[PDB]
Design a protein around this ligand. Structure first.
Ligand SMILES: [Ca+2]
Length: 279
């Protein structure tokens, strides 16, 4: 399949080179996988989700995404026009308030929720969780992310946006999950992206067009935007049978575009998520 005039990040994950515009992908498109987006919620009614999104849990008064961030991230995972895995099932877990903030205890609870809830869901190609969230180092947050991964979920987490070593951020610094840095459309490390030895991979994160609340769309930037590219890629590859939740991060690193990125410090991987799709 080919989506012409795709958002740059989708085109990027299907090319060995920057500057293309067409997103090339297998038509299976993540069908039969499930991605939990642990965030501010998901506006499941957005036409771009095509009925494939639902809220499953909220830690606030409403399950409504009153922010947009979670809807944007979910769109990069799995919306029709803006998503990597255009046929995946999306599940929203609202651990962040409508200002985009959340307490670690709540974030932890939402991770543990997913680890359990996936037993109520039919996800024959496997389960992914996208965590475009986090703050400073917390062993409890890292442990929660490690538990979610150990439970059989492919966990992708944002590296953080401090132009700093991700060792000091959580859940970014949990080694056992897939920690995602951000790049821009010219294959630079995004200005804000964290870096460091704990990063596993980079994905598109500067100027990423996706869904927003009120049935809208917008472009925003962050390691929060890179993370769902990797989560969606994992779902896509799991549906293809190329990898598993336990092994997907490593597979994505194995198959990434290598050495393409500029302003990558010493000790940080130079690896950009790539679907290796061959029609
Ligand atoms: Ca890792």
């Amino acid at each position: 399949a080919a989506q012409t005039n795709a958002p740059w990040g989708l085109a990027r994950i299907s090319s060995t080179s920057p500057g293309t515009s067409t997103y090339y992908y297998d038509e299976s498109a993540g069908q039969g996988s499930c991605v939990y987006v642990i965030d501010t919620g998901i506006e499941a009614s957005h036409p771009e989700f095509e009925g494939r999104a639902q809220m499953v849990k909220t830690y606030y008064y409403s399950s409504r995404d009153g922010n947009g961030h979670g809807t944007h991230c979910a769109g990069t995972v799995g919306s029709r026009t803006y998503g990597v895995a255009k046929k995946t099932q999306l599940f929203g877990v609202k651990v962040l308030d409508d200002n985009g903030s959340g307490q670690y205890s709540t974030i932890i609870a939402g991770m543990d929720f997913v680890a359990s809830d996936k037993n109520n869901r039919n996800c024959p190609k496997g389960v992914v969780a996208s965590l475009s969230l986090g703050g400073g180092y917390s062993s409890s947050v890292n442990s929660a992310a490690a538990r979610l991964q150990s439970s059989g979920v492919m966990v992708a987490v944002a590296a953080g946006n401090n132009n700093a070593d991700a060792r000091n951020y959580s859940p970014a610094s949990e080694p056992s999950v897939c920690t995602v840095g951000a790049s821009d459309r010219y294959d630079r490390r995004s200005s804000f992206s964290n870096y460091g030895s704990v990063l596993d991979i980079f994905g598109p994160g500067t100027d990423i067009l996706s869904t927003w609340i009120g049935g809208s769309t917008r472009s925003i930037s962050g390691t929060s935007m890179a993370t769902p590219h990797v989560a969606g890629l994992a779902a896509y590859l799991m549906t293809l049978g190329k990898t598993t939740a336990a092994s997907a991060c490593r597979y994505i690193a194995d198959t990434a575009n290598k050495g393409d990125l500029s302003n990558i410090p010493f000790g940080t991987v130079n690896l950009l998520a790539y679907n290796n799709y061959q029609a």
